[PDB]
Amino acid sequence: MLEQPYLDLAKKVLDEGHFKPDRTHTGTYSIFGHQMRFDLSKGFPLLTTKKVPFGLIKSELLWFLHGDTNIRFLLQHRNHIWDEWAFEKWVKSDEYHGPDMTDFGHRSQKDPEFAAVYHEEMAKFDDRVLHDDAFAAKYGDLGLVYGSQWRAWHTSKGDTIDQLGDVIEQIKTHPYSRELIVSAWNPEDVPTMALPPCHTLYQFYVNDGKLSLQLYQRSADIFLGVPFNIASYALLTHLVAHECGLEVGEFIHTFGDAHLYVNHLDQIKEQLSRTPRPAPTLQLNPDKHDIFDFDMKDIKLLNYDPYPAIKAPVAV
Amino acid sequence: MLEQPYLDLAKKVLDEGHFKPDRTHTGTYSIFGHQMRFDLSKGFPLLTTKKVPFGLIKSELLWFLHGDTNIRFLLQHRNHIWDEWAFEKWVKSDEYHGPDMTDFGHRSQKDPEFAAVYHEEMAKFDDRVLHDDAFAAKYGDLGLVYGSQWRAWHTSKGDTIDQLGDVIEQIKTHPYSRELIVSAWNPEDVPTMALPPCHTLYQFYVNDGKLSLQLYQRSADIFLGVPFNIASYALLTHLVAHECGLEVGEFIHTFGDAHLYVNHLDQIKEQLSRTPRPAPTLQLNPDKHDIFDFDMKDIKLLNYDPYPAIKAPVAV
Numbered sequence: 141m142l143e144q145p146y147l148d149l150a151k152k153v154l155d156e157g158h159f160k161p162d163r164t165h166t167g168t169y170s171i172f173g174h175q176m177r178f179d180l181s182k183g184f185p186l187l188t189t190k191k192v193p194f195g196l197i198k199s200e201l202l203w204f205l206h207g208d209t210n211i212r213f214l215l216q217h218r219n220h221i222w223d224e225w226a227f228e229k230w231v232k233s234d235e236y237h238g239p240d241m242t243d244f245g246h247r248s249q250k251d252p253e254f255a256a257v258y259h260e261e262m263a264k265f266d267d268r269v270l271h272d273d274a275f276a277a278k279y280g281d282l283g284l285v286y287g288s289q290w291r292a293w294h295t296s297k298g299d300t301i302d303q304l305g306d307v308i309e310q311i312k313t314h315p316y317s318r319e320l321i322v323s324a325w326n327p328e329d330v331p332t333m334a335l336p337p338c339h340t341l342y343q344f345y346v347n348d349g350k351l352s353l354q355l356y357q358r359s360a361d362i363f364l365g366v367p368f369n370i371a372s373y374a375l376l377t378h379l380v381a382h383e384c385g386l387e388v389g390e391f392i393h394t395f396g397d398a399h400l401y402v403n404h405l406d407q408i409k410e411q412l413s414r415t416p417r418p419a420p421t422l423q424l425n426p427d428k429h430d431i432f433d434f435d436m437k438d439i440k441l442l443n444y445d446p447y448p449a450i451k452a453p454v455a456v
Numbered sequence: 457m458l459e460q461p462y463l464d465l466a467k468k469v470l471d472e473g474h475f476k477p478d479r480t481h482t483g484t485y486s487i488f489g490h491q492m493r494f495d496l497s498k499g500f501p502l503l504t505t506k507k508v509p510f511g512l513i514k515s516e517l518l519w520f521l522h523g524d525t526n527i528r529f530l531l532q533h534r535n536h537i538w539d540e541w542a543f544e545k546w547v548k549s550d551e552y553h554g555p556d557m558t559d560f561g562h563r564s565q566k567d568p569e570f571a572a573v574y575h576e577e578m579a580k581f582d583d584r585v586l587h588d589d590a591f592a593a594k595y596g597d598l599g600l601v602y603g604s605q606w607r608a609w610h611t612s613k614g615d616t617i618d619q620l621g622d623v624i625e626q627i628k629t630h631p632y633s634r635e636l637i638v639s640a641w642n643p644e645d646v647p648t649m650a651l652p653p654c655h656t657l658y659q660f661y662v663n664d665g666k667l668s669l670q671l672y673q674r675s676a677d678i679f680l681g682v683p684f685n686i687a688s689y690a691l692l693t694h695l696v697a698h699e700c701g702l703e704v705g706e707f708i709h710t711f712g713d714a715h716l717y718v719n720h721l722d723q724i725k726e727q728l729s730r731t732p733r734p735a736p737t738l739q740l741n742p743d744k745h746d747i748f749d750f751d752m753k754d755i756k757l758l759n760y761d762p763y764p765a766i767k768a769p770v771a772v
């Protein structure tokens with residue numbers, strides 16, 4: 141089936157993954173170096189063996205494509221994936237005059253009441269961002285995140301490069317370019333960031349009228365991260381192919397440190413006892429083509445009939 | 457055998473590589489996305505099925521490690537690999553008062569006499585670089601090349617980052633870092649360069665006291681390039697492991713566009729009729745450890761008994 145490579149990756153990390161300590165000490169089973177390919181002409185690689193919220197993938201990718209760095213956009217579509225990076229700033233700011241939220245994460249994971257008070261501050265924070273523009277401009281702007289790395293890479297010359305916008309023209313004018321690459325990795329920014337870009341780099345490749353994309357993921361959470369990661373990029377492959385008037389080829393996923401945190405073992409095992417159902421199909425707006433102006437309604441997933449969602453601790 | 461993955465890659469590009477036009481129009485048989493791993497604990501991956509000049513690999517890697525960008529260093533060890541990038545500048549300069557060398561390459565490849573006059577200017581140019589410091593400082597300095605990308609990445613702040621020097625300390629202090637990455641890809645420089653870095657990015661990974669390295673090669677010449685490429689990086693894996701006092705693990709080679717130019721078909725076929733002999737061993741200076749101060753004599757290849765060298769047109 142289409143998602144087999146993912147399942148096979150899990151199987152593998154279980155059989156020959158070696159214990160490797162990580163920054164959160166939640167333990168991992170790792171492997172270094174791996175590659176999975178997906179023939180997009182055969183279906184959209186959204187996992188059928190567990191329900192994956194395609195809506196969170198759409199909004200987030202679009203946010204990236206708009207070159208947006210402000211969380212406000214996400215919260216407008218109830219996407220909270222990035223809420224904590226922003227929340228962190230608010231919490232550690234002199235303007236923050238409230239309860240002690242010393243890295244809320246670990247404490248909310250244990251203290252039942254902390255989770256509640258912490259959850260107030262988050263709901264509150266999100267509210268300010270959504271309604272108060274002066275607040276949003278300040279705390280809702282992550283800054284160095286995919287949207288700006290892809291579309292507004294800063295230069296010493298003082299200006300900014302739209303890596304992705306130039307790359308799409310490259311495919312239109314020079315489809316056989318061996319340089320259709322977009323890097324999210326900037327050495328000078330890398331050491332100050334709370335989380336250096338996991339999805340480090342990607343390359344396009346056109347042959348026979350089909351567009352392919354290879355992604356270099358430096359680090360991956362097999363259970364919780366990879367399912368989304370596969371969907372974001374296969375979707376982008378479709379969007380670019382759409383913009384460029386090309387057929388969709390393969391999405392090649394290359395990993396560095398692929399790992400399974402120890403608290404996801406039961407869940408991934410159960411996941412593996414399930415049988416993949418036929419894959420969904422992606423349909424895109426035929427008329428609208430400037431993918432940078434795209435929006436939710438312009439992209440639709442057909443026939444996604446998954447298995448129930450598997451709950452797991454974000455002890456990640 | 458150790459080099460089997462390379463041979464298997466050639467086999468593959470021959471069986472399912474599709475014709476894809478390239479910048480030189482010498483035709484290629486391409487594939488997109490591929491990964492080979494090499495267990496360095498089993499031997500040094502220098503091809504035994506054809507003689508590969510290990511000396512050119514040593515000097516070049518060392519040149520990179522010194523953060524050097526001047527060809528003079530290479531010419532001192534009779535390494536001419538980069539001679540043409542420098543030569544180009546001299547040829548297209550107002551100080552150049554001599555014969556018309558309109559992209560010598562293609563014309564020298566055909567015109568027998570051009571090859572001679574062109575060869576005079578190259579021998580001459582190299583001479584000036586080696587003896588004349590004012591000349592060398594000007595025309596012998598490539599500028600944006602691996603040594604400076606690895607060791608002197610320029611920042612908007614005006615200064616310069618030693619990516620590699622910081623990364624080795626990272627392995628010493630935080631061996632389990634999932635961020636031990638060195639990028640050679642700078643978006644703002646990429647469009648002005650005659651040849652954007654082929655070896656785009658690499659990542660280290662430490663587990664069980666063994667050091668591994670994964671390389672992302674955006675484009676590869678199966679016949680002429682890859683043999684060297686495999687040696688440069690597996691060697692670097694050893695050098696860093698040496699500096700850090702770690703065991704050598706695996707060298708993982710990830711490709712984007714792996715290709716065979718059409719004029720290398722007979723040669724690669726003949727290559728494939730040969731049987732790999734046992735692999736060589738690499739021995740490094742035990743006392744000397746600051747790999748940045750290393751030199752030729754500090755590195756030695758033992759037992760490299762290859763097959764004769766296979767000649768091929770650099771119609772690359």
Ligand SMILES: O=c1ccn([C@H]2C[C@H](O)[C@@H](COP(=O)(O)O)O2)c(=O)[nH]1
Pocket residue numbers: 163335336338358359360361362364365366368369456633634635
């Ligand atoms: O889209 C994402 C975002 C994050 N991660 C994971 C990778 C690691 O599991 C952890 C980050 O750890 P570092 O690689 O930064 O050390 O989050 C993913 O798998 N996918």
Ligand SMILES: O=c1ccn([C@H]2C[C@H](O)[C@@H](COP(=O)(O)O)O2)c(=O)[nH]1
Pocket residue numbers: 317318319479651652654674675676677678680681682684685772
């Ligand atoms: O160490 C090297 C240097 C160059 N090349 C090859 C890659 C391509 O065959 C050609 C460069 O073409 P572009 O990728 O820049 O388009 O040179 C290698 O394989 N190895």
